[PDB]
Structures are given as structure tokens and as C-alpha cells.
Design a protein around this ligand. Structure first.
Ligand SMILES: Nc1ncnc2c1ncn2[C@@H]1O[C@H](COP(=O)(O)OP(=O)(O)OP(=O)(O)O)[C@@H](O)[C@H]1O
Ligand SMILES: Nc1ncnc2c1ncn2[C@@H]1O[C@H](COP(=O)(O)OP(=O)(O)OP(=O)(O)O)[C@@H](O)[C@H]1O
Ligand code: NA
Ligand code: NA
Lengths: 226, 50, 220, 225
RNA sequence: UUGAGCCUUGAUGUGUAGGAUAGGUGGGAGGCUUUGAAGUGUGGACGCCAGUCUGCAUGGAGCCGACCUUGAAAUACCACC
């Protein structure tokens, strides 16, 4: 139910799309194919609501929750559990306002924020994140380990399980099998082929893309061919 | 030719804009001028949009 | 036997009357207990959205089913009315930190606007169990004595689920059928006043009266 | 790739390597030297030290035991796996390659860069601004320039395009000097690599068979659970 | 033969430390066995291969709440799911 109509996304001096239109119906897994330095991550950012459409009106249903995986995972000192729990937003924001309320002494706000937290599962978030991370390998000793080292193919599992912790409606996966083994690629596709919400994917792997994609958007020459 | 047409709108909360042109493939930025707003009769900041 | 006799005695294809159903439920009398009756009403609300949180309270004059000791927690001179309230709990800023570790809690909580220690100490213990102060529900209010008085009268509370349902207490099977009706109607009126704003559709899809040790049936 | 001198016959002195990363021990055993001209591919699961070994051979991770050695005249070519953000972010490609070729060269040193896909004013700015694909292409362009004779590739085809993959494979097939590359795709390892070592548990071994045997060998490990 | 939807019934599902494959709300702290208890002989199916699991008799008439580590707290049972 998402529509791009005369998008015209320009990036500083350079223009990525001149004027291009496409549609994605709900409950349909879509792939994005282009070149290197083409605009696929730019489109994902546009959906992520950071960049400016420059006259596109990309409107998609506003009652949706978006879980995304970005391209670059930097070196961070936060533990694995903190990195995974950070993915479930609306909890970090709530706790930020709660910290402000605690250090400003707003009695109404304390009870308000506690009620909001109790609305969602909240206190069981650590258990939920551990149960999720247990399926992607891991035992228990890496939970407090920092994400700074964590090999290269395990950091990918970290920031890939950072997305499955919120039960979203739109899943934006950007190159998700970059360092994964054949052990984990199979599990990822088993999950994806059973995914229920709407999924947009970016990958250069034909073998991975063949099973779990319905249609392709090709950004060839400043335009999107579906 | 190559110059587009942009509309810089008041920041003073009223709907009153100035329409002009801008080369969008030579100067990467958004215009941030300041000019008169006859609705409020004060010089305010007009920023480019469309 | 309980799952073998009344299950084949009742039939779920048809509704019953608001009074004949509860009369037959009194007739059931499966357990060797007092068989306090409860109610379960399925609401129409999108539990996925934080906007439609539903939290309220009602008063049932006839039967609450038990007595719950409210613990009023006031910081400073806030205990002036607490000492006269008569709650079974003892409130204290110093007695909060050790109190949480030692004793679990009372049946209710006392909201002290300036005593922000209950939030700082409760955490998993105070909130994860389901006994946290509720500013929107009405647990936190300047009238500490008024809240203490209200809590002792059977301030029936409720909250949604992952399915938007509500279930709570109405009384015992000992209490009369008319008492059950004039409690059900009061609870329903409180719920209908507490209905949120972005609530499309019918707000009551099903209402049921249940024996807490026996078998429940839909009432309306 | 251009033509280096490729003189040193003993590429490195390897003995009692005991690579650990400090807190633990990662690898202790080792395999046959690179014996100029050999082409080896490092198989193995994730978190097994395939990158520790590459960094240890590169000379950016001192072994705890010590004396990992390296020949006198080896020009190293190193392509990190995930630290693609190892090159300085604040510097544009032109003044990035300039500090690698400090003296001589001209403003027409950018003719070299233009042929690699940075063919405009893109040479005058660099940040996260660059996409992942051209950020991975810049590292390759900087590796090629100074005529390496020993290549170390930690999955160089992550963000590369399909045409990028074809060009890199064709160049590697013609490459002269020693080459070590680790990846999961069958196409690179079928055409370039010859030896196909395994990184097992805490040790690196010659291994037997091909990728067909390796992929079943992986699935046979799951019988332990 | 084969899809989708609706009503009903029976199974179905950790984690991290645990007696234990502790789904939510929370009513309860006891009914469940007696149209005849656990265990043993015996399959089925699942199997985060730890373990659930239910057709038959035999055996025949008992074991679960309590207190235990916890984010939680119990399939004691029963509700709406
Ligand atoms: N900087 C580091 N500090 C501590 N431990 C590290 C560091 N880098 C890696 N490790 C650990 O060393 C082991 C191997 O890491 P390494 O990055 O070499 O993996 P790999 O087998 O090459 O796989 P990958 O394809 O993920 O890179 C893992 O257990 C990892 O946690
Ligand atoms: N943050 C940025 N600021 C300015 N320009 C940018 C930025 N990110 C990208 N660009 C420009 O847009 C181009 C495409 O960037 P983008 O990340 O959208 O590419 P892509 O299609 O995702 O490619 P890749 O497959 O290589 O990741 C870049 O080559 C660059 O010219
Ligand atoms: Na990108
Ligand atoms: Na690596």
C-alpha cells in the first residue's frame, strides 16, 4: 500500500531519480536491485524519514512500525544486551523522559511514565532479548561482552537480532547476509519466508534472493522499473 | 533552461511566500533569506521550500 | 467430574439471561469453597497501540469477596492522615527501601506526590507484579486520607491484556442475584464512562459471569 | 594489478605463533608458508580466527609468543573485512592518495583515480557521504597503486557490484604475487584459490577435499548436538 | 480432490541462576483419585534430543499448593483468550 509517485530525489549536486513511480502492495516481499552508488540506501533512508523527498510524496500508511537494519556497524563499547535492547525503541525514549522526571521531581510524570512502561512488557525486555539472542547462537557469557570485538559474522547477528525485538510491520533489510555463514543464512531465510509483515530487501546475492522475494524494483537510469 | 522554480515561505506562521528561481545543480543548499511579511508587517526569515 | 458433569449440562450455543444465568451458576456449586464469582468482559480496543490504554476503578457495595490492606506511603508529614486512615500497611521513606526487599506489599499502594521513593525502589518488584501507583488510574492524588478511605470500600481495579479484555471481581456466590445485577451494572457504567477516545466499533463484544473454581458462562 | 619485484623467497618466518588477542588464545598452530606464487583460501566457520590470522600475517596484531617475522622487501596489500572504516573519514580521496604518494605526482595524479570510478569532483570530498560500494572500491584503488606483491583479502566482495566482482576476479586470476583471500562465495575460490586451508578449532590445517566436501563437513558438525 | 473464512474440541510453546520445555492477564492458596490413585509392563507423536506426551489393562486408591532460585511465579484447578 506504499506508493512513490514522481519521486525526484537529489543528493546535493547530484540527482538520483529524475521522476519515477512505483507501488508496493501490503504483504509482499520486495527486492531492490541497482548499481554501486545508485540510491538504494537513499530510498531506505527516505522511508526511514530522515532525508527530504524534494517533491515526491512517498506517502505510506502512517499507522505502521518500522524495523530497519543499516549498512555500517561501528565499534561500540555497549554490551551485546544493551545493543540488542536499544533496537526496541519507545523504551529508550520512555526511560529518557523517566530519567528527566526523576531528576526534575515531576510526580505526575513519574506515574505517567511508569504506566506507559507497564503498558508494554517492559520489565521482561532483558528476558525477551536473551531468548531471541539464544536462537542466533550465543550462550550466556557473551551477553555482557562488548560488541566492540564479537568477530565479524557475530556482530552481523547482533545487529540483525536488533531488528527482531519489536514486532514491526515494515522490515527494511539492507544487505543482511554480508558476513553470515551458510549456517545462519538458512535460518534467516526460514524466518523471512514465514514473515508476515511487509519486507523490503537490498542484496546482490541471486541465490539468496531467489526464494523469498515476490517482485523487484530496479533503479537503472534515474528511474525505477518494477 | 536549467533554473528551477522555488517558493520561500515565511517562518512567522502565516501562509505568505515569495516565488523565485534557483539553480539546483550548482548551489547545493536551501535559501535562508529575510524579507518583509505584509501579513504581520515585520521583517522575518524566509526559507526555501516546495 | 467438575469438567465432566456441568460441561455436559451447559450448552454454549445460546445465551442466557442476566439473572437466570447467575441463578444457575449459584445452583452449580461445584467446589467445596466459597466460590466467589468474577466477571470477564471482552472489549473492542487495539491493544497494539499505546493510545487506547484503559485503566479505571469501580465500587461494589454488596460484595468485594475479601479485605485488602492498603499501604499508604507518604514522605514527610504525609502520614498525618495516614495514621487516621487505618490501612494495614505502614509507610515510610526509610521503611520503603528495606520494606521492598523484605515484605512484598499490601493489596494497594499510597501515592505520595513528594515521596518519589516508591518508584525508585519498586522497579521489577513494585511494578512487575502489578501493584504500582497509577496517576491516570487514580492511585496518586493529594487527598491521601480520601484515597485510603476509598481503598477500604472495595475499589475494584482492572487493566487490559494483549487482547484488550478485562476481568475482575464482582462478589461471592453467597451474595444475592439482585446484588450481582446492581454490581454488574455499576461496573459496566464505570467502564463505559472510562471508554477511550479513539475507540471505534462496539466497546463490549462479550460479557461473562464466572465461578472462580467452577465453570463460567456468557451472561449478556 | 601491476608488476612488483617479487624478490623475497622466504616470505616470512613462522614459528610458535600462539595468537591470542590478550584475554584468550585464538590460534597456536600454523601451516605452510606462502612460498611465493602460492594461492591459498581460508575456509572455516565464523568466530574461528580467519581474521586474526590475516591481521597477524599483516603485522597489526603482535603475537603473544612473538617472532612472527616478515621478509625484508615485501609490499603488503591488506583489505580488512569489516573495518572498511579504517581509512580516514575526514580526507578526500585525492589528498588521501597524495599522502600515500607524497612527493612528485601532480594534479594529474587524479587521472589515475578517475579510471576507478571517482571520475569527477567526487575526489574533493569524502565522509560517510561515500556509499558502501565506492568506499570498498577506494580501498581497492589504493591497494593497487603501490604495486603490492603479497595480497591479503578479508572478503573483498562484500559491497562490490557484480561488474566489480567480475573485474576483481579477472584481475586476481592474472595476478602474479602471493595471494591469501577468505570468502564464502564459490566463484572466487573456484577460479583463484588453489590450496584451501581450514581454520578448525584453535589451529589451522591443510584440510582435504574441496568446497563440496567442506559444505557437508560443516553439516556433520551439528551431530555433536 | 483442493483453497479462504466462521463455531467447537484436544494438543502447542524455557531459558540464562532453576526440582522443572515458569504464554499473558490473577480467582484462588486446595481440589483433584474415586464412572475407582501413583509407579511398573507398552506404543504413538513432538523433541530449544533436557524433556512433554497419551489408547489398554495390570497395579488397584493417591500426588500436586505450602517453603524453593526469580523479570515473573506456578499445568491445584478454572475463567476470557
Ligand atoms: N579485538 C578483539 N578483542 C577480543 N576478541 C576478539 C577481537 N577480535 C576478535 N575477537 C575474537 O576472536 C575470535 C575470532 O575473531 P575473528 O574476527 O578473527 O573471526 P573470524 O573467524 O575471522 O570470522 P569472521 O568472518 O566473523 O571475521 C572470536 O571469538 C572473536 O570474539
Ligand atoms: N550522506 C550522504 N551525503 C551526501 N551524499 C551522499 C550521502 N550518501 C550517499 N550520497 C551520494 O549518493 C550516492 C549513492 O548513495 P547510496 O548510499 O544511496 O548508494 P547505494 O545505492 O545504497 O549504494 P551501495 O550499494 O554502494 O551501498 C553516493 O555515491 C553519493 O554520491
Ligand atoms: Na548503501
Ligand atoms: Na574476519
Amino acid at each position: 500500500m506504499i506508493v512513490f509517485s514522481s519521486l525526484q530525489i537529489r543528493r546535493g549536486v547530484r540527482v538520483l531519480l529524475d521522476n519515477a513511480t512505483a507501488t508496493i502492495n501490503p504483504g509482499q516481499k520486495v527486492g531492490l536491485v541497482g548499481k554501486n552508488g545508485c540510491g538504494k540506501s537513499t530510498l531506505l533512508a527516505l522511508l526511514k524519514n530522515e532525508i527530504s523527498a524534494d517533491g515526491g510524496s512517498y506517502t505510506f500508511p502512517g499507522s505502521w512500525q518500522l524495523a530497519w537494519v543499516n549498512q555500517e556497524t561501528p565499534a561500540l563499547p555497549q554490551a551485546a544486551l544493551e545493543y540488542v535492547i536499544d533496537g526496541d525503541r519507545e523504551y529508550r525514549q520512555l526511560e529518557a523522559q523517566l530519567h528527566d522526571a526523576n531528576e526534575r521531581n515531576d510526580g505526575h510524570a513519574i506515574a505517567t511514565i511508569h504506566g506507559k512502561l507497564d503498558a508494554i512488557d517492559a520489565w521482561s525486555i532483558r528476558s525477551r532479548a536473551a531468548s531471541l539472542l539464544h536462537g542466533l547462537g550465543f550462550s550466556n557469557e557473551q551477553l555482557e561482552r562488548p560488541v566492540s570485538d564479537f568477530s565479524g559474522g557475530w556482530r552481523m547477528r547482533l545487529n540483525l537480532a536488533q531488528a527482531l525485538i519489536c514486532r514491526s510491520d515494515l522490515l527494511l533489510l539492507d544487505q543482511p547476509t554480508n558476513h553470515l555463514d551458510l549456517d545462519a543464512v538458512i535460518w534467516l531465510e526460514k524466518w523471512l519466508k514465514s514473515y508476515q509483515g511487509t519486507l523490503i530487501l537490498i542484496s546482490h546475492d541471486r541465490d539468496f534472493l531467489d526464494p523469498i522475494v515476490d517482485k523487484i524494483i530496479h533503479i537503472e537510469q534515474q528511474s525505477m522499473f518494477e | 533552461g536549467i533554473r528551477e522554480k522555488i517558493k520561500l515561505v515565511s517562518s512567522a506562521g502565516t501562509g505568505h511566500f515569495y516565488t523565485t528561481t534557483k539553480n539546483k545543480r550548482t548551489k547545493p543548499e536551501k535559501l535562508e533569506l529575510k524579507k518583509f511579511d505584509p501579513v504581520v508587517r515585520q521583517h522575518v526569515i524566509y526559507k526555501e521550500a516546495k | 467430574k467438575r469438567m465432566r458433569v456441568i460441561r455436559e449440562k451447559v450448552d454454549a450455543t445460546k445465551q442466557y439471561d442476566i439473572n437466570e444465568a447467575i441463578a444457575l451458576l449459584k445452583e452449580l456449586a461445584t467446589a467445596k469453597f466459597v466460590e466467589s464469582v468474577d466477571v470477564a468482559v471482552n472489549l473492542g480496543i487495539d491493544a497494539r497501540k499505546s493510545d487506547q490504554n484503559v485503566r479505571g476503578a469501580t465500587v461494589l457495595p454488596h460484595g468485594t469477596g475479601r479485605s485488602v490492606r492498603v499501604a499508604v506511603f507518604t514522605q514527610g508529614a504525609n502520614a498525618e492522615a495516614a495514621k487516621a486512615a487505618g490501612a494495614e500497611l505502614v509507610g515510610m521513606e526509610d521503611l520503603a527501601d528495606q520494606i521492598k526487599k523484605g515484605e512484598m506489599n499490601f493489596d494497594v499502594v499510597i501515592a505520595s506526590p513528594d515521596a518519589m521513593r516508591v518508584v525508585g525502589q519498586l522497579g521489577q518488584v513494585l511494578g512487575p507484579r502489578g501493584l504500582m501507583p497509577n496517576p491516570k488510574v487514580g492511585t496518586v492524588t493529594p487527598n491521601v486520607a480520601e484515597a485510603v478511605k476509598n481503598a477500604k470500600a472495595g475499589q475494584v481495579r482492572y487493566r487490559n491484556d494483549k487482547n484488550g479484555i478485562i476481568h475482575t471481581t464482582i462478589g461471592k456466590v453467597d451474595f444475592d442475584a439482585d446484588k450481582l445485577k446492581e454490581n454488574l451494572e455499576a461496573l459496566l457504567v464505570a467502564l463505559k464512562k472510562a471508554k477511550p477516545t479513539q475507540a471505534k466499533g462496539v466497546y463490549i463484544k462479550k460479557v461473562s459471569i464466572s465461578t472462580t473454581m467452577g465453570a463460567g458462562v456468557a451472561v449478556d | 594489478f601491476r608488476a612488483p619485484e617479487s624478490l623475497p623467497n622466504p616470505l616470512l618466518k613462522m614459528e610458535k605463533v600462539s595468537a591470542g588477542y590478550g584475554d584468550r588464545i585464538i590460534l597456536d598452530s600454523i601451516k605452510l608458508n606462502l612460498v611465493p606464487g602460492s594461492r591459498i583460501g581460508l575456509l572455516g566457520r565464523n568466530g574461528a580466527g580467519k581474521s586474526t590470522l590475516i591481521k597477524l600475517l599483516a603485522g597489526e596484531l603482535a603475537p603473544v609468543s612473538g617472532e612472527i617475522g616478515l621478509a625484508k622487501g615485501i609490499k603488503l596489500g591488506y583489505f580488512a573485512q569489516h573495518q572498511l572504516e579504517y581509512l580516514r573519514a575526514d580526507e578526500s580521496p585525492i589528498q588521501h592518495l597524495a599522502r600515500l604518494a607524497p612527493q612528485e605526482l601532480e594534479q594529474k595524479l587524479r587521472d589515475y583515480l578517475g579510471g576507478f570510478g571517482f571520475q569527477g569532483d567526487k575526489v574533493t570530498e569524502e565522509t560517510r557521504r561515500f556509499s558502501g560500494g565506492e568506499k570498498a572500491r577506494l580501498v581497492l584503488a589504493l591497494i593497487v597503486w603501490q604495486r603490492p606483491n603479497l595480497l591479503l583479502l578479508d572478503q573483498p566482495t562484500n559491497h562490490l557490484d557484480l561488474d566489480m566482482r567480475q573485474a576483481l576476479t579477472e584481475a586476481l586470476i592474472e595476478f602474479e604475487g602471493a595471494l591469501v583471500v577468505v570468502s564464502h562465495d564459490r566463484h572466487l575460490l573456484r577460479s583463484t584459490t588453489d590450496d584451501l586451508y581450514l581454520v578448525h578449532d584453535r589451529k589451522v590445517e591443510p584440510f582435504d577435499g574441496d568446497l563440496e566436501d567442506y559444505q557437508q563437513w560443516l553439516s556433520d558438525v551439528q551431530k555433536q548436538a
